[PDB]
Design a protein around this nucleic acid. Structure first.
Ligand code: CL
Ligand code: CL
Lengths: 386, 386
RNA sequence: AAAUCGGGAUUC
RNA sequence: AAAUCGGGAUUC
């Protein structure tokens, strides 16, 4: 029976194929794989006496950095390498550091950094023929919304390319069939047109302003589930929002943007709902200030963005580092790993994101469902409600 | 580039932790693990040119025997052992046999055997205090339903045991707390009382009659989803139904029964809905003949039983064996493996079922939700509807 | 966080 | 078969 010390473990993972961070049998989770590696490496033996997590990343949500707290066997001086050898390629342990007895992953978390990877073709306007396009274009009863000749040019180049290859065969419905093969090739051509799209500087600036609409303290009751507008804990403080320059990655050469959000605390699916709302405001040509209207008591249903693009970048423990460094305890700083994670993120997270995006068309499917859906549609009009 | 022959592969698996049989990235499925083992063993290289499955077992559904058809590399005389070495312990390949070019897993499937493992305490009447118990007992407006002094004795022995250990503390609501620990121990005592239950011969005979209500050809539109009563394909033929004698298995010594259903063809979630309906009829004390009323055009919502207890025992290919044996092709008979599967079923399927039942309380949670739910409730009364 | 029961709108 | 968007009733 070896001794056990209460330590914090810094880890990172691609969340694809796992049912979130929190241990939840019988479905594979990040924590179940971590525990299997711990047992196979000698970190634990045989509730797990004080187990703790900093963030319960949802189904499919990745994390460049996450932390847990537990009583481990630190006797092996090469225990980290053993655990990493016993782990799958998509999960890694960055470090192991001793913590004080009163350490609490969640209560000592001062802030959180999140990153969302979004394909730039998500900001193209809805396809002509969709209900959202019909309702937005037919919003000439109040001539407020942008014109967005860029999306018009994209869709019309797609129409010219389709017509120069599918001589009025003209796909209409389907529910192992030569028709289906024809349709398959049309949708593949449309996806290829999406992948060749390069966002303009104006659309990027518009999206940056729409995301900047989130800075400061706001009532985010519409950006979660089961939160009342009058609840005081519905107010959240976003410290910073940064939208990266566009960047091309992958064999299909598809364009992406990185959205880093630093906030004091977040509610369930807050990041994805914010991202989705900013994307809809940008791609529909609405005044970005309308995002602030979402803070009102009127309830709006914001469909959360796909989990595939979400990464928990790092939890932050400001008070712990500032007020417990005199006790000899090492500070918890994920940036000390920043380069290593940066490699892992590119090799085992971002690559998975690009592969699943080009294989299953996650983002385009999400936005095609939004496009064809008869609360949010009203908000994205020229006229909202009140 | 090795040659490839079109073969059929006989496999078995525990479905826990997998998203069904059909290959469906990015979530792990039985077929994705099979393909990984195939690649690692040399069975395939690099749609999969004619891939076929006999049955698309749902999420969590096991199978003592399932079959697939594909073009494999059969050059290795020890290819089966290599694939099995490359497979996890919960998935096994029983055999590989050559098939004719026109072979079609699903179209040549003449019938199907299914097995459902049900804990006998699922047949105990609803707990006094539940809405279902209140509605059934208060069905004295039409004095039709059984009395079931056995369930009364069970619940009253539980009440005597609880009161002799929890002196009117008396748990009332909860939503890390000493109360919760008390409640935890009450529910554990109730679960232990359930695990010690041994079904009487009368209840077993009643359940056997309720299941026999399914024999022959019937309209099973209520025993699936999205099937209209007037659709001719809503009629299904059950060739045989056998309920095994009760048997005790596991460390907690819990009692189980095996329900084997041989049918020509089945609709989506038909087995689980039939099982659930028979169980409700038995545990509520209804005339078993009322099950035939479910074949009427009136729509009833039958909650499907947990997937944990379902096994696809074997698909059957009668016509293929009878009309293609002269062509030199070996018959496809899963019974030729019956002993081997029988070991695997006990070591990697039934054991998982018992462990998950005693760890997560799947069946009792399902029936506790049924018990407290304000269409089916009306059917389980003395008065149905019409 | 995850899972269940159903009901509604979609996706090779 | 699986997956998505939501809405409703539940489960350490
Ligand atoms: Cl999350
Ligand atoms: Cl199934």
């Amino acid at each position: 029976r070896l001794p056990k010390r209460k330590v914090a473990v810094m880890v990172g993972y691609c969340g694809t194929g796992y049912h979130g961070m929190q241990y939840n049998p019988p479905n594979p989770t990040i924590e179940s794989a971590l525990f299997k590696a711990f047992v196979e490496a000698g970190a634990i033996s045989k509730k797990k006496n004080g187990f703790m997590r900093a963030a319960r990343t949802a189904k499919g949500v990745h994390a460049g950095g996450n932390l847990i707290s537990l009583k481990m066997i630190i006797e092996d001086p090469d225990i980290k390498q053993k655990i990493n050898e016993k782990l799958p390629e998509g999960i890694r342990v960055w470090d192991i550091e001793r913590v004080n007895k009163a350490f609490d992953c969640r209560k000592m978390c001062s802030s959180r950094w999140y990153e969302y990877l979004l394909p730039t073709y998500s900001l193209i306007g809805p396809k002509p023929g969709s209900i959202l396009y019909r309702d937005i274009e037919e919003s000439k009863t109040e001539l407020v919304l942008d014109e967005d000749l860029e999306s018009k040019e994209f869709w019309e180049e797609f129409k010219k390319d389709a017509n120069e290859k599918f001589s009025t065969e003209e796909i209409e419905a389907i529910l192992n069939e030569e028709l289906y093969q024809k349709v398959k090739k049309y949708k593949q051509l449309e996806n290829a047109h999406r992948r060749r799209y390069r966002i303009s500087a104006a659309k990027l600036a518009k999206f940056r302003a729409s995301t900047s609409q989130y800075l400061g303290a706001h009532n985010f009751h519409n950006f979660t589930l089961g939160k009342d507008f009058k609840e005081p804990s519905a107010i959240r403080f976003m410290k910073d929002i940064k939208v990266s320059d566009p960047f091309v990655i992958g064999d299909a050469q598809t364009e992406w943007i990185s959205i880093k959000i630093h906030g004091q605390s977040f509610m369930l699916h807050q990041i994805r709902k914010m991202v989705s709302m900013a994307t809809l405001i940008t791609r529909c040509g609405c005044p970005v200030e309308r995002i602030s209207q979402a803070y009102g008591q009127q309830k709006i249903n914001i469909p959360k963005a796909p989990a595939l693009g979400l990464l928990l970048e790092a939890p932050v423990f400001e008070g712990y580092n500032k007020r417990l460094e005199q006790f000899g305890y090492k500070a918890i700083d994920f940036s000390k790993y920043q380069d290593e994670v940066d490699k892992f993120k590119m090799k085992h997270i971002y690559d998975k994101i690009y592969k699943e995006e080009v294989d299953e068309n996650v983002f385009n499917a999400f936005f095609s469902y939004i496009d064809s859906f008869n609360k949010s549609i009203f908000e994205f009009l020229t006229a909202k409600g009140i």
